[PDB]
Amino acid sequence: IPASEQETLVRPKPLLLKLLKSVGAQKDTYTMKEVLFYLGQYIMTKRLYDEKQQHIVYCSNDLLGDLFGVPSFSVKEHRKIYTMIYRNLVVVN
Numbered sequence: 001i002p003a004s005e006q007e008t009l010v011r012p013k014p015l016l017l018k019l020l021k022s023v024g025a026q027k028d029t030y031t032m033k034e035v036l037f038y039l040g041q042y043i044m045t046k047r048l049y050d051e052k053q054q055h056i057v058y059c060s061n062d063l064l065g066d067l068f069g070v071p072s073f074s075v076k077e078h079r080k081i082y083t084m085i086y087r088n089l090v091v092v093n
């Protein structure tokens with residue numbers, strides 16, 4: 001994953017915007033850095049992740065599961081996480 005991906009400007013779709021607004025998000029255009037931070041905050045706030053769980057996020061009965069279309073995912077699979085996030089936004093250029 002190149003460093004530049006973090007600077008990508010994005011407009012989240014309604015479901016993702018709903019999720020972001022729960023952890024402070026105020027805006028309609030974000031950087032991918034912001035989106036990844038607010039998602040991370042959402043995950044740790046809802047205890048969907050822990051280091052004793054083999055690096056897995058459990059989102060089966062949660063908004064995040066509906067957004068991503070999976071009951072769970074590994075935090076090590078970075079490219080797959082970007083793909084899941086991209087289905088819920090539109091890039092700005």
Ligand SMILES: CC(C)(C)CN1C[C@@H](N)[C@H](c2cccc(Cl)c2)[C@]12C(=O)Nc1cc(Cl)ccc12
Pocket residue numbers: 036037039040041043044049075077078079081082
């Ligand atoms: C899981 C937790 C430790 C709470 C947060 N992790 C730690 C980072 N290594 C990871 C991450 C950072 C940047 C890009 C990616 Cl692809 C993944 C990240 C994160 O910072 N945001 C975010 C969002 C989602 Cl949906 C999944 C995983 C993450």
